[PDB]
Design an enzyme around this catalytic site. Sequence first.
Site, PDB file in Angstrom:
ATOM      1  N   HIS E  58       0.450  -1.477   0.285  1.00 58.99           N
ATOM      2  CA  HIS E  58       0.000  -0.269   0.062  1.00 58.99           C
ATOM      3  C   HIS E  58       0.899   1.886  -0.008  1.00 58.99           C
ATOM      4  N   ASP E  88       4.558  20.422 -27.517  1.00 57.18           N
ATOM      5  CA  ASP E  88       4.799  19.518 -26.472  1.00 57.18           C
ATOM      6  C   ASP E  88       5.674  19.261 -26.305  1.00 57.18           C
ATOM      7  N   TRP E 123       8.599  -0.562   3.702  1.00 62.16           N
ATOM      8  CA  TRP E 123       8.378   0.323   2.436  1.00 62.16           C
ATOM      9  C   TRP E 123       9.975   0.631   2.659  1.00 62.16           C
ATOM     10  N   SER E 153      12.030   6.428 -14.469  1.00 61.41           N
ATOM     11  CA  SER E 153      10.952   6.948 -14.741  1.00 61.41           C
ATOM     12  C   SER E 153      10.346   8.423 -14.796  1.00 61.41           C
ATOM     13  N   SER E 154      10.299   8.522 -13.756  1.00 63.92           N
ATOM     14  CA  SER E 154      10.308   9.955 -12.877  1.00 63.92           C
ATOM     15  C   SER E 154      11.994  10.497 -12.738  1.00 63.92           C
ATOM     16  N   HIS E 237      14.192  11.910   2.172  1.00 62.92           N
ATOM     17  CA  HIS E 237      13.814  13.103   2.340  1.00 62.92           C
ATOM     18  C   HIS E 237      13.732  13.923   1.512  1.00 62.92           C
ATOM     19  N   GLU E 239      12.394  12.734  -1.676  1.00 62.63           N
ATOM     20  CA  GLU E 239      11.269  12.222  -2.199  1.00 62.63           C
ATOM     21  C   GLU E 239       9.776  13.309  -1.879  1.00 62.63           C
ATOM     22  N   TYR E 241       9.541  16.008  -0.313  1.00 63.43           N
ATOM     23  CA  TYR E 241       9.962  17.210  -0.261  1.00 63.43           C
ATOM     24  C   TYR E 241       9.714  17.088  -2.225  1.00 63.43           C
ATOM     25  N   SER E 252      -0.987  27.835  -4.930  1.00 61.95           N
ATOM     26  CA  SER E 252      -0.148  29.111  -5.153  1.00 61.95           C
ATOM     27  C   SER E 252      -1.530  29.443  -6.917  1.00 61.95           C
ATOM     28  N   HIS E 286      17.592  12.956   9.801  1.00 66.90           N
ATOM     29  CA  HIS E 286      17.110  13.420  10.768  1.00 66.90           C
ATOM     30  C   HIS E 286      16.059  12.433  11.019  1.00 66.90           C
ATOM     31  N   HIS E 287      15.627  11.411  10.247  1.00 63.97           N
ATOM     32  CA  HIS E 287      14.531  10.221  10.565  1.00 63.97           C
ATOM     33  C   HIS E 287      15.373   9.061  11.188  1.00 63.97           C
ATOM     34  N   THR E 312       8.621  27.488   4.552  1.00 67.56           N
ATOM     35  CA  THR E 312       7.632  26.888   4.357  1.00 67.56           C
ATOM     36  C   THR E 312       6.812  28.087   4.624  1.00 67.56           C
ATOM     37  N   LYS E 315       5.801  30.814   2.304  1.00 65.73           N
ATOM     38  CA  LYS E 315       5.042  29.519   1.113  1.00 65.73           C
ATOM     39  C   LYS E 315       3.732  30.039   1.953  1.00 65.73           C
ATOM     40  N   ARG E 434       4.963   0.664  15.615  1.00 66.84           N
ATOM     41  CA  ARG E 434       4.173   0.554  13.615  1.00 66.84           C
ATOM     42  C   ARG E 434       4.361  -1.013  12.813  1.00 66.84           C
TER      43      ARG E 434
HETATM   44  C1  HEA Z   1       0.958   8.927  -0.907  1.00 64.33           C
HETATM   45  C2  HEA Z   1       1.100   8.448   0.432  1.00 64.33           C
HETATM   46  C3  HEA Z   1       0.010   7.728   1.390  1.00 64.33           C
HETATM   47  C4  HEA Z   1      -1.422   7.431   1.613  1.00 64.33           C
HETATM   48  C5  HEA Z   1      -1.998   9.432   0.727  1.00 64.33           C
HETATM   49  C6  HEA Z   1      -2.022   6.828   2.472  1.00 64.33           C
HETATM   50  C7  HEA Z   1      -2.627   6.715   2.668  1.00 64.33           C
HETATM   51  C8  HEA Z   1      -3.964   6.210   4.121  1.00 64.33           C
HETATM   52  N1  HEA Z   1      -2.848   5.670   4.515  1.00 64.33           N
HETATM   53 FE1  HEA Z   1      -1.151   5.207   4.608  1.00 64.33          FE
HETATM   54  N2  HEA Z   1       0.639   4.835   4.533  1.00 64.33           N
HETATM   55  C9  HEA Z   1       2.468   5.981   3.777  1.00 64.33           C
HETATM   56  C10 HEA Z   1       1.488   6.430   2.203  1.00 64.33           C
HETATM   57  C11 HEA Z   1       0.358   6.453   2.484  1.00 64.33           C
HETATM   58  N3  HEA Z   1      -0.609   6.582   2.770  1.00 64.33           N
HETATM   59  C12 HEA Z   1       3.501   5.297   3.702  1.00 64.33           C
HETATM   60  C13 HEA Z   1       4.485   5.793   3.609  1.00 64.33           C
HETATM   61  C14 HEA Z   1       3.457   3.955   5.365  1.00 64.33           C
HETATM   62  C15 HEA Z   1       4.651   3.752   6.106  1.00 64.33           C
HETATM   63  C16 HEA Z   1       4.224   2.321   5.525  1.00 64.33           C
HETATM   64  C17 HEA Z   1       5.694   1.397   6.398  1.00 64.33           C
HETATM   65  O1  HEA Z   1       6.280   3.304   6.677  1.00 64.33           O
HETATM   66  O2  HEA Z   1       5.690   1.247   7.277  1.00 64.33           O
HETATM   67  C18 HEA Z   1       1.788   4.391   5.103  1.00 64.33           C
HETATM   68  C19 HEA Z   1       0.916   3.316   6.801  1.00 64.33           C
HETATM   69  C20 HEA Z   1       0.400   3.350   7.148  1.00 64.33           C
HETATM   70  C21 HEA Z   1      -0.396   2.804   8.170  1.00 64.33           C
HETATM   71  C22 HEA Z   1       0.458   1.759   8.848  1.00 64.33           C
HETATM   72  C23 HEA Z   1       0.908   3.020   9.986  1.00 64.33           C
HETATM   73  C24 HEA Z   1       2.712   1.792  10.200  1.00 64.33           C
HETATM   74  O3  HEA Z   1       2.817   0.937  10.314  1.00 64.33           O
HETATM   75  O4  HEA Z   1       3.361   2.520   9.700  1.00 64.33           O
HETATM   76  C25 HEA Z   1      -1.726   2.702   7.914  1.00 64.33           C
HETATM   77  C26 HEA Z   1      -2.463   2.555   8.515  1.00 64.33           C
HETATM   78  O5  HEA Z   1      -3.403   3.222   9.212  1.00 64.33           O
HETATM   79  C27 HEA Z   1      -1.967   4.063   7.114  1.00 64.33           C
HETATM   80  C28 HEA Z   1      -3.692   4.268   6.455  1.00 64.33           C
HETATM   81  C29 HEA Z   1      -3.554   4.623   5.237  1.00 64.33           C
HETATM   82  C30 HEA Z   1      -5.166   5.629   5.022  1.00 64.33           C
HETATM   83  C31 HEA Z   1      -6.445   4.879   5.890  1.00 64.33           C
HETATM   84  C32 HEA Z   1      -4.988   5.947   3.642  1.00 64.33           C
HETATM   85  C33 HEA Z   1      -5.798   7.229   3.891  1.00 64.33           C
HETATM   86  O6  HEA Z   1      -5.796   8.412   3.011  1.00 64.33           O
HETATM   87  C34 HEA Z   1      -6.945   6.705   2.392  1.00 64.33           C
HETATM   88  C35 HEA Z   1      -8.029   7.073   2.342  1.00 64.33           C
HETATM   89  C36 HEA Z   1      -8.127   8.300   1.091  1.00 64.33           C
HETATM   90  C37 HEA Z   1      -8.494   8.806   0.271  1.00 64.33           C
HETATM   91  C38 HEA Z   1     -10.073   8.901  -0.706  1.00 64.33           C
HETATM   92  C39 HEA Z   1      -7.722   9.646  -0.234  1.00 64.33           C
HETATM   93  C40 HEA Z   1      -6.790   9.009  -1.426  1.00 64.33           C
HETATM   94  C41 HEA Z   1      -7.514   7.361  -2.753  1.00 64.33           C
HETATM   95  C42 HEA Z   1      -7.626   8.634  -3.640  1.00 64.33           C
HETATM   96  C43 HEA Z   1      -7.658   7.287  -5.146  1.00 64.33           C
HETATM   97  C44 HEA Z   1      -6.411   9.967  -4.075  1.00 64.33           C
HETATM   98  C45 HEA Z   1      -7.307  10.669  -4.800  1.00 64.33           C
HETATM   99  C46 HEA Z   1      -6.517  10.600  -6.405  1.00 64.33           C
HETATM  100  C47 HEA Z   1      -6.875  11.022  -7.285  1.00 64.33           C
HETATM  101  C48 HEA Z   1      -7.777  10.118  -8.195  1.00 64.33           C
HETATM  102  C49 HEA Z   1      -6.724  12.488  -8.117  1.00 64.33           C
HETATM  103  N4  HEA Z   1      -0.820   3.968   6.381  1.00 64.33           N
HETATM  104  C1  HEA Z   2       4.893  14.090   2.406  1.00 65.63           C
HETATM  105  C2  HEA Z   2       5.699  15.481   2.542  1.00 65.63           C
HETATM  106  C3  HEA Z   2       6.791  15.733   4.015  1.00 65.63           C
HETATM  107  C4  HEA Z   2       6.487  16.654   4.391  1.00 65.63           C
HETATM  108  C5  HEA Z   2       6.204  18.203   4.088  1.00 65.63           C
HETATM  109  C6  HEA Z   2       7.168  16.454   6.178  1.00 65.63           C
HETATM  110  C7  HEA Z   2       7.699  17.949   7.048  1.00 65.63           C
HETATM  111  C8  HEA Z   2       8.624  17.740   7.403  1.00 65.63           C
HETATM  112  N1  HEA Z   2       8.755  16.279   8.000  1.00 65.63           N
HETATM  113 FE1  HEA Z   2       8.363  14.418   7.799  1.00 65.63          FE
HETATM  114  N2  HEA Z   2       8.205  12.327   6.733  1.00 65.63           N
HETATM  115  C9  HEA Z   2       7.587  12.471   5.971  1.00 65.63           C
HETATM  116  C10 HEA Z   2       6.754  13.436   4.673  1.00 65.63           C
HETATM  117  C11 HEA Z   2       7.236  15.359   4.555  1.00 65.63           C
HETATM  118  N3  HEA Z   2       7.848  15.658   5.907  1.00 65.63           N
HETATM  119  C12 HEA Z   2       7.344  10.830   6.021  1.00 65.63           C
HETATM  120  C13 HEA Z   2       7.115  10.427   4.556  1.00 65.63           C
HETATM  121  C14 HEA Z   2       8.041  10.842   6.835  1.00 65.63           C
HETATM  122  C15 HEA Z   2       8.232   9.153   7.031  1.00 65.63           C
HETATM  123  C16 HEA Z   2       7.652   8.303   7.734  1.00 65.63           C
HETATM  124  C17 HEA Z   2       8.371   6.879   7.722  1.00 65.63           C
HETATM  125  O1  HEA Z   2       9.484   6.695   7.546  1.00 65.63           O
HETATM  126  O2  HEA Z   2       7.811   6.051   7.116  1.00 65.63           O
HETATM  127  C18 HEA Z   2       8.848  11.933   7.794  1.00 65.63           C
HETATM  128  C19 HEA Z   2       9.625  11.847   8.739  1.00 65.63           C
HETATM  129  C20 HEA Z   2       9.978  12.779   9.435  1.00 65.63           C
HETATM  130  C21 HEA Z   2      11.366  12.912  10.719  1.00 65.63           C
HETATM  131  C22 HEA Z   2      10.954  11.021  11.037  1.00 65.63           C
HETATM  132  C23 HEA Z   2      10.509  10.538  12.733  1.00 65.63           C
HETATM  133  C24 HEA Z   2      10.817   9.278  13.017  1.00 65.63           C
HETATM  134  O3  HEA Z   2      11.431   8.357  10.844  1.00 65.63           O
HETATM  135  O4  HEA Z   2      12.011   8.388  13.679  1.00 65.63           O
HETATM  136  C25 HEA Z   2      10.681  14.233  11.031  1.00 65.63           C
HETATM  137  C26 HEA Z   2      11.516  14.207  12.326  1.00 65.63           C
HETATM  138  O5  HEA Z   2      12.903  14.733  12.041  1.00 65.63           O
HETATM  139  C27 HEA Z   2      10.376  14.871  10.467  1.00 65.63           C
HETATM  140  C28 HEA Z   2      10.559  15.929  10.386  1.00 65.63           C
HETATM  141  C29 HEA Z   2       9.687  17.193   8.717  1.00 65.63           C
HETATM  142  C30 HEA Z   2      10.250  18.793   9.347  1.00 65.63           C
HETATM  143  C31 HEA Z   2      10.805  19.076  10.389  1.00 65.63           C
HETATM  144  C32 HEA Z   2       8.898  19.118   8.027  1.00 65.63           C
HETATM  145  C33 HEA Z   2       9.212  20.387   7.875  1.00 65.63           C
HETATM  146  O6  HEA Z   2       9.401  20.666   6.133  1.00 65.63           O
HETATM  147  C34 HEA Z   2       8.004  21.346   8.004  1.00 65.63           C
HETATM  148  C35 HEA Z   2       7.796  22.532   8.602  1.00 65.63           C
HETATM  149  C36 HEA Z   2       6.511  22.753   8.231  1.00 65.63           C
HETATM  150  C37 HEA Z   2       5.768  24.002   9.648  1.00 65.63           C
HETATM  151  C38 HEA Z   2       6.131  23.952  10.745  1.00 65.63           C
HETATM  152  C39 HEA Z   2       4.842  24.657   9.112  1.00 65.63           C
HETATM  153  C40 HEA Z   2       4.404  26.045   8.194  1.00 65.63           C
HETATM  154  C41 HEA Z   2       5.468  27.334   9.188  1.00 65.63           C
HETATM  155  C42 HEA Z   2       5.147  27.776   9.547  1.00 65.63           C
HETATM  156  C43 HEA Z   2       3.286  28.331   9.925  1.00 65.63           C
HETATM  157  C44 HEA Z   2       6.136  28.620   9.962  1.00 65.63           C
HETATM  158  C45 HEA Z   2       6.843  28.549  10.515  1.00 65.63           C
HETATM  159  C46 HEA Z   2       6.859  27.734  11.956  1.00 65.63           C
HETATM  160  C47 HEA Z   2       7.086  27.900  13.299  1.00 65.63           C
HETATM  161  C48 HEA Z   2       8.208  28.975  13.687  1.00 65.63           C
HETATM  162  C49 HEA Z   2       7.017  26.579  14.276  1.00 65.63           C
HETATM  163  N4  HEA Z   2       9.645  14.163   8.742  1.00 65.63           N
HETATM  164 CU   LIG Z   3      11.871  13.635   6.230  1.00 62.70          CU
END
Ligand code: HEA
Ligand code: HEA
Ligand SMILES: [Cu+2]
Lengths: 55, 114, 99, 51, 530, 117, 268
Positions: E58, E88, E123, E153-154, E237, E239, E241, E252, E286-287, E312, E315, E434
Amino acid sequence: NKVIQLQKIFQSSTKPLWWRHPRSALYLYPFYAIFAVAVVTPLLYIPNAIRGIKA
Amino acid sequence: NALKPAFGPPDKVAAQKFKESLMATEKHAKDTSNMWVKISVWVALPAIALTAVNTYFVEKEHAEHREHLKHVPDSEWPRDYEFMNIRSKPFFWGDGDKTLFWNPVVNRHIEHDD
Amino acid sequence: ETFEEFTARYEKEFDEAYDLFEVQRVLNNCFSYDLVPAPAVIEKALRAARRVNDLPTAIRVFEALKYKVENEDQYKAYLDELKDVRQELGVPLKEELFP
Amino acid sequence: VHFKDGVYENIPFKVKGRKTPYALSHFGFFAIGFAVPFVACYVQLKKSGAF
Amino acid sequence: WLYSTNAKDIAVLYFMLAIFSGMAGTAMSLIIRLELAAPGSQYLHGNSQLFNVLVVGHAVLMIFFLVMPALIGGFGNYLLPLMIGATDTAFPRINNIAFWVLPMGLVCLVTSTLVESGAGTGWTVYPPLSSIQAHSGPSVDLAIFALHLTSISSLLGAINFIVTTLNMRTNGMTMHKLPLFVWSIFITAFLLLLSLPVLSAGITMLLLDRNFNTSFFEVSGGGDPILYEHLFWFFGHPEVYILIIPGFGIISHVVSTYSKKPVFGEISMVYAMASIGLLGFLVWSHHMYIVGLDADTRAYFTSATMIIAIPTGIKIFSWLATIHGGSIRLATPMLYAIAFLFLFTMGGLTGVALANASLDVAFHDTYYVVGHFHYVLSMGAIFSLFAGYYYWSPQILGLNYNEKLAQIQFWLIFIGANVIFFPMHFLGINGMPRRIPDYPDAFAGWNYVASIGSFIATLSLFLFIYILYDQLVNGLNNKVNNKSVIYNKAPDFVESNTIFNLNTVKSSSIEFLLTSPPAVHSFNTPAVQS
Amino acid sequence: VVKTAQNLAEVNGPETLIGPGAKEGTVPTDLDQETGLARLELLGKLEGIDVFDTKPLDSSRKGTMKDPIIIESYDDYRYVGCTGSPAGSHTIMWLKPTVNEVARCWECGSVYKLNPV
Amino acid sequence: THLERSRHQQHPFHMVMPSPWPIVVSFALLSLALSTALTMHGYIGNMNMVYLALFVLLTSSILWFRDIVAEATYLGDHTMAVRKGINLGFLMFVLSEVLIFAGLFWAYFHSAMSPDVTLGACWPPVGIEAVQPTELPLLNTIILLSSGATVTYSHHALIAGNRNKALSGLLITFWLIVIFVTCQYIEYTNAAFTISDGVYGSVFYAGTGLHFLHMVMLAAMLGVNYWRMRNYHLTAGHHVGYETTIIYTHVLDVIWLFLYVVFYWWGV
Ligand code: HEA
Ligand code: HEA
Ligand SMILES: [Cu+2]
Ligand SMILES: CCCCCCCCCCC(=O)OC[C@H](COP(=O)(O)OC[C@H](O)COP(=O)(O)OC[C@@H](COC(=O)CC)OC(=O)CCC)OC(=O)CCCCCCCC
Ligand SMILES: [Zn+2]
């Protein structure tokens, strides 16, 4: 030498560009023979690969 | 007539900057290419003329060195370490082949169970 | 830039209006600024509507003036100020018309 | 699609003029995509003892 | 048609697959959340395998087969030809392999589950869990190849966008005046280029340590599994972003269209948008705060990944400045783009709480992380994908989408997925780990709260299929009755109704000045700007 | 009968854009073994007038309805930008002057006609 | 005039007919990746489907390339910008293939910058003997410094107009690279440590391993740069199929010198 000669043949050919070479008829039917086998035999062994039957 | 006067104005000012520079780059394709003939076939090819024969002689002392190890070990192997030979999931094109091509002068791999 | 340079610039552009389009596209950005327009420039926003023979773009002046007045006390003193040039042209307001 | 920028002719579907109703061929593309984990939950349980 | 090289008809194949992989990527998350409904294995009988298979099944369909091919492929192959002024793409023949390897990236993944083992690796495919002594069959062999077909592809799908923007513009389109959706993807294309070859070595080395036993990662031989934790996460990270910068491009455009006003600080929005992309490179461990790094190395990252919250904030506060003065026309793309501005930013506050090395040591691998990264994936990259579809659906398909029925699909997504992902912060602050099929009995509280919501969001997605049915069958009979909204910009206060039909679309982009649908040659003359 | 062009003036069809064959012993000298549309751009580049335009529209004057701005179109719907009388003074707005209807540019006030050619 | 101008294209950028080799290469990448993961686990018996998958892929590249040279010299939408499109599309591409070395250089700085415990406290460890840089590896650097002085000796020579230096100057560069394959075949046949020789055996046949897997395509790139220049395809004012070969080698001096300083000089 053949660059102006092929340019008469390629320009205003009214053909697909991968059929526009004069030395292209033999390039495809053996190529379509190796293409008709390399996309089924990796996939026909998949029901053989579901039951543990390996080699 | 209607709607077909001409494409545009032939000012001839956009010319004579790209055309004459094609001969100027041709000069830069002439004297600079002749700058490398004094260093490719006159410097670098004599540089490998003294380097290849330097490595033609040190090749033969190693070509005879491999004949010692493939002949006899005279007791056994020196019992190589645990990181040098690994055979988790042995290879698939044959039975236990190390790679696509490997001579036993350096890759003997005798098992020491003991 | 200032309040007076706002007045002199848009009371000038209403004169070369010549069309219904270049009244409404200039009445728009005479109302879409941070500040509130003076009654000197809005007098040329009714004379511009008289030059183009369109009445509801002169009734929409006093309705854009009603929302963007920020105070009802600063509107009735602003309405009675314009009543000298609003009774010549016979421009009603939207509440008196009851459409 | 190379030409004929009509209304339905930038999509590789056949929406109107189909022999069969389109809800067969539209839900049948999105429910089939919904039923692919429910056959991964079938041939991996029946292989591994469960049912 | 199948192998037509027109960039318009490729991006409609991209979008035709990102829902098929979507309704497979969320049917797996249905069964995942159905198993976390009660303690004890309910629907899966006793199998803790096929749960680390469904989670990786998933989480990679959502990342690499939904949000990657839609926000980069499904839109970038349709809008970057169109908004800039190209006919194109610059490389239109490799534009077709960038789609047609994605179903081949699916046969390399659905058959990775049907084989006897099942890739129960998660994953983040870690080396000793996925090593050949642990995972024996050909299950994880295909799961590290479907991740390679999408990696390739990407990658060429972003070389297609650096030599499109840099030379194939119009006359007056200087380098400081572009649409922000193009500056989203062109900045993204300098992250797709400089992070995917890092990944492609970090997976092939795991292939070499599995059937060629080379011991890049094998412990018997000195190969660390901790090299993987900085080499995969060097891709990881950037990916995440990349799933948000085209998400920062659509928002925007929507929030400054449905507010009749240009965006606040456009030159400020393009410098704080590559600074996210550039500084996102320098924060990649940081992960892995707890994995045993140095006391100054973690001291650098606890100060360096907080600086991602500097651009951010620019933005976001500018999106709270570009709608302050102007009007607000609350249609469906404006509803998504205004709930994106509340649920993504709450996924940012949980970001800077996790960002500290002094606080990730009580939060790693818990459910507080999954509460954080789902507020920025299903609420920051689905809230900008639904706000991009509804913003360009009748302009591109030609048919309107029953606006009264797309408002109930917004609210069932808003409150029907906030009910899932908000109590995840409570299960993780206690310490539920998890990827587990069962849990201690004290974690049955919110895991039944978050289980009632996955039927709410996936009932809205069943409704979204019907909106796609109402849009294709009698989607022409929508703009002739009062079902939908036709003009996305209502006229001004002093703009008369009879003069509006002369000057109808007051857009700031070419995308609406085209016909609906656009032509097969919508650019047969070099257009001019200013 | 179908000769070559060797000048920007004569085209008279697509079969006259090729060049002549070069004898063995020397390379093609950029004018002999050419191709067509690449040679067509080169033949225009051989002279002092560009075949394609990289120049903005004449954004100096505003353009009323009695005195509009004329664009050098080649089809029906040439899209234009409108960035100001100093070409930088307001937000852009894209237009489409079609056949014998004008684009009116609600914000800036510029009028464009097609000139379909 | 305008009547011929209404019969031609009005924008310099290229429009391509629908070719089916897009889905041919895609079907080969399926049967590459699917079949290379089956024979590692059985189900076939023989290792030749991968050899089939390397044959249908590479003939699909030249049929892709046969249509491209049909567009390069026989149809010709190659204007100044489209010439700058590929010349920047390939110069930005090799930024990706120079960063994949940083996915392999950084493993060498992961096992030698900090000493480990499973091996010795020295790099290269005991039992493993490395080749000094004052040996046949020093021939590998000078033969590319001589290659870097003959690829530009024949770069300007093709533009220079004479075919005595342009044709013959690329045959001497082509056999300078096939002879580079065979001296990187000595260490693949005469060196002590193997691919499975721990972490020193891993990254040494990876950093120099991928540097060997690019000469099979570079010599194949010269295999058409001599055939086309003999069949009069390439020109002296417009050459893309010749320009991408020089930048394939002018950056190769930089990466091999960074490969020589840490694998051999710092690697002993
Ligand atoms: C793109 C990223 C993405 C999205 C959208 C989701 C969406 C959801 N995810 Fe998932 N999820 C992950 C990425 C994502 N997840 C990742 C990386 C992990 C961790 C795996 C690992 O590290 O072990 C994870 C893990 C994860 C867990 C396990 C937690 C753990 O073990 O770490 C669970 C269980 O609750 C969960 C649930 C859901 C649910 C309920 C949604 C719901 O939001 C989905 C239902 C909502 C929808 C209806 C909207 C989406 C449907 C579409 C079709 C999109 C629409 C777009 C077009 C059609 C235009 N996700
Ligand atoms: C897809 C989008 C996405 C985005 C945008 C971000 C954005 C950020 N993520 Fe996250 N992150 C994930 C997706 C994302 N992350 C995923 C998939 C994982 C890992 C899960 C996995 O391993 O399965 C992860 C994991 C992850 C970890 C690892 C935790 C762990 O596994 O132990 C940490 C910790 O540092 C982190 C931090 C952040 C931070 C600091 C930002 C920052 O960029 C965000 C900052 C934004 C703001 C703060 C808000 C707007 C700003 C303000 C209003 C003004 C400024 C704010 C203040 C002064 C407070 N992310
Ligand atoms: Cu990160
Ligand atoms: C895998 C794919 C599976 C897909 C399955 C998804 C199913 C979702 C179906 C949603 C749907 O089709 O609804 C749209 C349909 C047409 O609406 P319209 O936009 O043309 O405008 C109508 C007008 O403007 C106002 O309609 P009006 O107000 O006059 O009718 C009252 C209506 C409102 O109540 C409800 O919506 C909930 C019951 O109540 C009823 O009709 C009750 C009749 C029994 O509106 C309806 O009439 C809905 C009737 C109920 C259908 C069953 C509901 C199940 C939850
Ligand atoms: Zn304007």
